Ligand binder design. Structure first.
Ligand SMILES: Nc1ncnc2c1ncn2[C@@H]1O[C@H](COP(=O)(O)OP(=O)(O)CP(=O)(O)O)[C@@H](O)[C@H]1O
Ligand SMILES: [Mg+2]
Ligand SMILES: [Mg+2]
Length: 451
């Protein structure tokens, strides 16, 4: 036995928030080696809720040097005497062992590992745990592959694994290729599946779209917007449309009414967080209600798309992180949606990339608004390029259904406003400006005045 509860509450991936833990106990312990245990740990709260975490424990008969305090779980008596329990994901040999189980498509008790057909795993490469802030734990093997081990685990089909598999197996080149994964059952053999981790090809020497965009939007004296990042935005549009096309073919398309009631509920909630919104709520609602009964085509989509979710390798843009929007339940995250909502996500991201500069400057540094003008011009140029690149692949310009597109942009801006009002008041002018602009964009498109 180990004092799991005392250890887990200090971990950055632990989501207990401000809650009292009743118990933290292993639901399932699966030996991998004589000194390596896979553990499904159930944390029970006072309201009776249970949240399950995945832990891999490396046992040692004496203090091992390389483990930090955060990787030290506890101590316990075993058959040969005292043992120390370490978080095995920080052990190179243990991480390699997991990768080997994936490589072999091994089954260990109720744990099912699978290597994607034809995939090669870098079993020789040095494993190093990612230092990047996240809710899971990732081990990078050399420059070749990333093993992501999920911390909080839940029942059902994992959309990140699911959609990456579809895309990779269809030969889509705009993903970091899924190389393998592993899972178990929720309540023993014969019950709901539970995804545990994934292995993906590591995109070495890549840049995040957000970093490239902000660099472009910060270039001094760039009053005449350049063509280089527009070229990149066009290529990114190609990539997003390509991903959408593969997903549409594999997982189908259908039609639904535009979700007026859903976006209205989000508006009502947002207006409680951002009082600034009440002055615009009537106008937003009118635009949404004009779409009542509008049929929209939906399909499986990325679901949380922005410039932080795309990587530029030396050869291509890749889309990563298909888990869906962080706050939604799994069934909702696997629902089809409009591809235009993904497009809207990128357009919002361009807006923030350009205007972050302005909210960080003092008023006196842009008294005549010329940097603001440049930001607007940069967003317009790159948004147009992105949409054109999308159109080149889709064979249909997202701006054609401009009313639906603008409504999704508006819904995102309303959500952003509520967020900034709560967490970052100085950023609130960004979505508020967007709302006024998009209100006009949407009004124009509803009258079919858009180009
Ligand atoms: N295949 C790959 N090759 C190279 N870098 C990758 C990669 N997959 C992810 N990354 C990088 O690793 C980091 C983590 O990416 P990820 O999409 O998991 O962030 P995230 O913020 O969504 C974590 P969480 O969802 O838990 O909050 C990012 O900096 C991302 O650019
Ligand atoms: Mg991400
Ligand atoms: Mg993520």
């Amino acid at each position: 036995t180990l004092a799991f509860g005392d250890w887990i509450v200090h971990r950055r991936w632990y989501a207990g928030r401000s809650r009292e833990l009743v118990s933290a106990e292993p639901a399932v312990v699966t030996p991998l080696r004589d000194d390596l245990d896979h553990i499904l740990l159930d944390v029970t709260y006072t309201d009776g809720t249970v949240e399950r975490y995945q832990l891999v424990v490396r046992w040692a008969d004496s203090p091992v040097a390389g483990f930090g305090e955060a990787a030290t779980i506890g101590t316990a008596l075993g058959p040969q005497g005292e043992r120390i329990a370490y978080d095995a994901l920080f052990d190179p040999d243990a991480a390699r062992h997991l990768l080997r189980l994936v490589d072999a498509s091994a089954t260990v008790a109720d744990l099912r590992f699978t290597r994607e057909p034809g995939a090669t795993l870098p079993l020789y490469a040095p494993p190093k745990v990612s230092s990047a802030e996240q809710s899971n734990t990732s081990v990078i093997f050399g420059k070749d592959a990333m093993l992501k081990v999920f911390r909080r685990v839940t029942p059902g089909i994992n959309p990140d694994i699911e959609l990456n598999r579809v895309l990779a197996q269809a030969g889509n080149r705009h993903v970091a290729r899924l190389l393998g994964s592993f899972e178990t059952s929720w309540a023993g053999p014969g019950t709901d599946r539970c995804a545990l981790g994934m292995v993906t090809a590591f995109a070495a020497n890549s840049a995040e779209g957000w970093d490239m965009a902000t660099a472009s939007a910060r270039e001094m004296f760039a009053d005449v917007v350049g063509s280089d990042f527009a070229d990149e935005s066009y290529r990114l549009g190609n990539a997003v449309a390509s991903v959408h096309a593969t997903l549409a073919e594999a997982l189908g398309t259908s039609t639904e009414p535009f979700p007026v009631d859903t976006v209205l509920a989000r508006l009502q909630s947002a207006a409680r967080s951002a009082p600034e919104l009440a002055g615009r709520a009537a106008a937003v609602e009118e635009r949404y209600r004009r779409l009542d009964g509008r049929a929209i085509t939906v399909q499986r989509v990325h679901g949380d798309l922005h410039l932080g979710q795309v990587l530029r390798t030396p050869d291509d843009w890749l889309l990563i992180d298909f888990e869906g929007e962080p706050g939604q339940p799994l069934d909702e995250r696997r629902r089809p949606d409009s591809p235009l909502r993904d497009v809207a996500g990128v357009l919002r991201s361009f807006e923030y990339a350009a205007y972050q500069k302005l909210v960080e400057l003092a008023p006196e540094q842009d008294a005549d608004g010329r940097l603001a003008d440049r930001a607007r011009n940069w967003v317009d140029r790159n948004s147009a390029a992105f949409c054109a690149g999308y159109a080149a692949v889709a064979g249909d310009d997202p701006r054609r259904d401009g009313d639906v597109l603008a409504a999704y942009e508006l819904d995102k801006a309303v959500y952003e406003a509520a967020y900034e009002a709560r967490f970052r008041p100085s950023w609130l002018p960004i979505p508020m400006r967007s709302i006024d602009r998009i209100l006009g964009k949407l009004a124009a498109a509803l009258e079919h005045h858009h180009h």
